[PDB]
Symmetry: C3
């Protein structure tokens, strides 16, 4: 399979020479092999991208209850996110300060205190070490609380940053709020979660995500509701919006629902509320709303889909009736974890207000089709005969946009 | 298992120092550990041996039909071999020139055109890019056809070479033709294929193949039909042929069937038509022909077995009634893929002219026994206590011959 | 799982800089990450610790019969231990001197001679090559006997050393004999063996073993019979023995059973006969003897447990009724094999004198609980946020003792 091909390919690969490769890179072409296949570049992507930027973790509604927690792995980091006694959500390194053990072993739960399973060093929900057995009179517990992790709440969506010197989150947060607040995500519940591993590099997952050049042949279910128009998927709107699209933005905004396409100065994130195809209202097989009790106050009913990406961790679709978040996490040079979360109103009842299959089938199928595509792409790229090829200017503008953001971010980090 | 032992062994291994190891190598001894166990030597074997020499791929009869194709992996290369519209068989890198994707995902099939599953760039069966959607007015498709792979047809057997500067194939092809043509391989069909992975280095598979020192204890089925006489398996005939053997060569050649032992000047290949044991006619449990409708025009009926090896990819047995090809492909430092293909006349009918079990049981068993032997050999070699030992001059002349060819080829490539 | 976390963690890890890390190490703290996670340190641990020190292999009673043998893997070494024709137990490298093959493929068995399965080079049970087929007149078999492995018999327990220059074993052997001889281990049989792989570094297995700081929360079955008192598990007795403990040592020694705590000058090994909790006599759920026919002549019946450790390979519990040996063998940087062997009197009859479940359930459970603990510890340590933490002086004195022995041994080896 791909794991073998990965080993085979790295055996004869030329040196990574990253500065030389970055120097000769042209924006209109796919990346040279080792960006997608080498452990050297993968290590740089972890150190300089995933461990330095803000990352989407989970919806805040998963931490609704007192003492609730959820855990996730980011690269080699094990993080626990908890609702503290004061109602604040905080994140910590899930590593006991005694001898290093994980403290929370389950993916989610509720606790009164964080108690290490090894020797029961006990921490308060704010990270403070409040009991350590028989450590002697010269032990200073104030030096041994859990190590915090930088955390922000983006209007009901929890973001974290593993750096001691996180970049600016506030510009993004301020920009996004008008678009997100109308979805009332703090009042959501998780209706379903799907976690899959795709056997391709995280950048291949993103390049695939940032175009619909592949969609008509590969996504029969999605194409019923999501338009193939390159302006929707891509970033050609940044230079100017078509009349048809602006007319949609205006219908939304006349109705009080922010829609207008906005792209970060540095290209890290984009928000836009795009029309669905034809008469579709939601990502379903019949095109109608999946949930009869809407999540948020979006108007009009055919307001379409709020697209939001924030590199490197997340793309999202916020519809009038429900919302979907996607989290991208690196597993190895040729493996990527994608977590899709369906959010519905907290009072929407499964079997009454929505049907689980009807709610999820379209994107379950789509993700599976994307995974197959990404994996097939990865296998060809592993050939030593692979060379960069040209992106379509009309169909892949969004791919070039992502690859530029990635290369610039890496260049800056290596400076 | 062996994968663990591989990791354990490389941890404490001395540096590879390949030039120093090559310098001190004596031809009468097995190779020092890292030749059989190290990823450093494995990488050199791929780069300098498998990616530079002509390799057996598949019988041409698998590409009998219009638009037929077959795919194979050689190291990290994914290759597709196709019968083009003009009747020519060509090979290409199975990597789309857009973003790199595999084009043909199945092991075999038929197509009208080669259509990439990702964004449907469409290629003619000669590799030319004939359609690429929405690539703009400055896109030159003539720069983006599939990359060709050097290919030859050795009398019904397809060989390929991954180098842009392939070595001479013509000397071998010219020498082999008289021996092969009488088997009419272009009129064969594949009756059966067996693919196994042996957990030993590709060179251990070859060293095992090039002797029958192990045969009497390890191959009860084979020994019924294949002689143990070292002159048969080995290369002592190169210095002079025994009277008994020459008498066999003469029976064949008086009957118009080329038999005489011939060995390449550089040792890369050897052809010889050798007698079977006793009264055996074929590789069966009862010694009689497996197929009643013969593949080719070999005479007399006890002409025996045409042995042909061509390093590094193939050994072969061509009998009067059917033929067997073996393809050796490297998987990792301690793994090798061996593909055995049974060829019979295209009009031979399974259940009438041959029985599948009767046709295949002997070599299925033999390959399994060889695999066990090679794997057991590999495990001992992984010990840091392993040191070269002496080959038997009488029983292992053919092993020394292979190891010399390998070492010389590596020396020349590193020069 | 852990294998992924291992790969993730090594990607961004700082250089190992082992001399710098060793230089700054403080004895009161857990080790810096790469000691527990890096392949570089693992390679040094194999080369300088496991391949240089004496290691426990198996009880001699497994080699009771003529021509009996047993095999084990130590790192990448494959070793065979055999009872020779003269009654001596010897060990050899299980690698044929011809081409390297394993000779003995089974874990245990009996043979007349050691016959290589490949080409049947035949060795006497003392390693001498007595037959090699068709090797020519200039073959000197005296140069090609099996390579010996240094072996000692510690009062019924077989120890080996992979170095050509083994350290002193005699000081340990002489010290241990009075304690061990009363267990009559030469008259034992193996009642049961359990082999498990724990997904943590071998040093984490040892650090866990050398404290009961974790025991009250994690070992309900064990705590019924094994005391939590830090003086029992640890090495605080080295500076002076409590009155209660000395009273126990005196009961044993008045009765002729050596008990007194003794610790090696260099800390490599320790023997002590410790009291069990409450009225317990053995490691059972009811606290009574597991076997009605005792192994050895220990007195009094509540003499408790003879604890013996010898780094890096073994800890042991010798009770009045039966004994348990534990063998620690490295598998990878984050994997360790632990083999627990229950020894009972050779005439003790399963189903009459002991019940298999009753005999083994306590330590089967305990080992499983330890494995979970070690694996959870390993996962947290893999975080790049992991930093050394302080050991409990009162509860983890034995952990510091082991870590000191390890660091000193590595320092000396690198000198
Ligand atoms: C639906 N795909 C194609 C382009 C947009 C992307 C998304 O999920 O945002
Ligand atoms: C049958 N074995 C032993 C020597 C020849 C080899 C072969 O398959 O060509
Ligand atoms: C029972 N554990 C805790 C300390 C002693 C250790 C042992 O098995 O020797
Ligand atoms: S590792 Fe957490 S209390 Fe010891
Ligand atoms: S990768 Fe083949 S058409 Fe895009
Ligand atoms: S490898 Fe043992 S006899 Fe040949
Ligand atoms: Fe898609
Ligand atoms: Fe064989
Ligand atoms: Fe324990």
């Amino acid at each position: 399979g791909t794991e073998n091909l990965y080993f085979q390919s790295m055996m004869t690969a030329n040196p990574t020479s990253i500065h030389q490769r970055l120097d000769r890179r042209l924006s209109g072409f796919s990346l040279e092999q080792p960006f997608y296949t080498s452990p050297e570049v993968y290590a740089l992507d972890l150190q300089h991208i995933f461990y330095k930027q803000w990352l989407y973790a989970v919806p805040v509604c998963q931490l609704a209850k007192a003492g609730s927690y959820t855990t996730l792995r980011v690269g080699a980091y094990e993080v626990v996110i908890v609702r503290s006694r004061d109602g604040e959500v905080r994140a910590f390194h899930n590593s006991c300060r005694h001898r290093g053990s994980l403290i929370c072993k389950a993916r989610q739960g509720q606790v009164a205190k964080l108690v290490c399973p090894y020797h029961q060093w006990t921490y308060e929900l704010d990270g403070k070490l409040i009991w350590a057995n028989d450590m002697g009179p010269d032990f200073d517990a104030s030096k041994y609380g859990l190590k915090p992790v930088n955390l922000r709440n983006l209007d009901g969506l929890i973001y974290i940053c593993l750096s001691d010197t996180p970049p600016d989150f506030q510009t993004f947060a301020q920009l996004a709020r008008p678009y997100l607040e109308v979805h009332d995500l703090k009042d959501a519940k998780v209706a379903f979660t799907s976690t899959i591993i795709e056997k391709g590099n995280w950048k291949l997952v993103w390049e695939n995500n940032r175009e619909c050049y592949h969609c008509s042949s590969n996504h029969p279910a999605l194409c019923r509701s999501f338009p193939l128009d390159p302006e929707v998927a891509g970033v050609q709107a940044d230079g100017g919006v078509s009349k048809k699209l602006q007319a949609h933005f205006d219908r939304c905004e006349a109705a009080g629902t922010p829609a207008q396409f906005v792209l970060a100065g540095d290209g890290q994130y984009r928000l836009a509320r795009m029309p669905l195809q034809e008469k579709a209202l939601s990502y379903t097989m019949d095109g109608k709303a999946a949930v009869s009790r809407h999540l948020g106050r979006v108007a009009p009913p055919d307001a379409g889909t709020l697209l939001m990406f924030h590199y490197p961790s997340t793309w999202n679709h916020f519809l009038p009736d429900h919302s979907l978040t996607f989290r991208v996490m690196p597993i190895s040079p040729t493996e990527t974890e994608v977590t899709t979360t369906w959010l519905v109103h907290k009072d929407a009842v499964e079997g009454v207000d929505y049907d689980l299959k009807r709610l999820t089938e379209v994107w379950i199928a789509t993700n599976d089709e994307d995974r197959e595509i990404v994996e097939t792409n990865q296998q060809g790229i592993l050939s030593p005969a692979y060379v960069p090829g040209p992106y379509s200017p009309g169909q892949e503008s969004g791919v070039m946009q992502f690859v530029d953001w990635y290369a610039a971010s890496l260049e800056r980090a290596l400076a």
